[PDB]
Amino acid sequence: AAQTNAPWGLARISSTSPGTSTYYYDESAGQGSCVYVIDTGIEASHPEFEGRAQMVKTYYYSSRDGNGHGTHCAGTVGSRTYGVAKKTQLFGVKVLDDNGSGQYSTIIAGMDFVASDKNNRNCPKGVVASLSLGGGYSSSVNSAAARLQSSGVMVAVAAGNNNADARNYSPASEPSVCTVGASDRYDRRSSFSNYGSVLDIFGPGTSILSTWIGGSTRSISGTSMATPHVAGLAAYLMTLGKTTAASACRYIADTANKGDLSNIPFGTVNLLAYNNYQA
Ligand SMILES: [Ca+2]
């Protein structure tokens, strides 16, 4: 399939080179997979989600997204226009309040929630979680992301936006999950992107157009925008039978565009997510 005039990040993800604007992908499109978006929630009613998004959990007075961030992330995973996996099921877990903040204890509970709740969903092709959040190093937070991953969920997490080594952040520093750095449309490391030996992959993170609350759209930037590209890609590859939750991060890094990014510090991977689709 071919989506013309796609957001640059979608095009980039299906291209060997920057500067193109059509997204190419197998039509299966993540059908039969599920993605949990663990964030400020999802505006499920947005026409762009077409009935495929649902809120399954909140730790606050409402399950509605009063911020927009979780909705933007969900749109990059699987909205019809702005999404990598246009046919996946989307499940929202609101661990962040409408200011985008959450206590570590709440965030950990939300991860363990998904690790059980996936047994209540129909996802024959596999399950992914996108965690666009972070804070200082915490072994409890890391350990929670490690459990989610070990229960059979492909876990993708933002590296962080501090322009600093991600070893100092959680769950970014957890070795067993997929830690994702941000790149821009000219294949440069995003200027805010964390880096370090703990990064597994880069995805599009600067000027990313996607869904927002109130039924609209907007462009914003962050490793939190790169993460859902990688999460959407894992779901898409799992429905294609190419990989599994346990090995998707590895597979994505093995099949990535290699050595194409600029401003990667010595010792950080130079790998950019790529769907290897031959149209
Ligand atoms: Ca990691």
Curated annotation (Swiss-Prot):
Binds 2 calcium ions per subunit. It comes from the Eukaryota. GO terms for cellular component: extracellular region. This is Proteinase K. It catalyses: Hydrolysis of keratin, and of other proteins with subtilisin-like specificity. Hydrolyzes peptide amides. GO terms for molecular function: metal ion binding; serine-type endopeptidase activity. One of its GO terms (biological process) is proteolysis. Disulfide bonds join C34-C123, C178-C249. Its cofactor is Ca(2+). Belongs to the peptidase S8 family. Ca(2+) 1 binds at P175, V177, D200. The keyword Glycoprotein does not apply. Ca(2+) 2 binds at T16, D260. Residues 7-279 form the Peptidase S8 domain. Keywords: Calcium, Disulfide bond, Hydrolase, Metal-binding, Protease, Serine protease, Signal, Zymogen. Its EC number is 3.4.21.64. The active site is at D39, H69, S224. Hydrolyzes keratin at aromatic and hydrophobic residues.
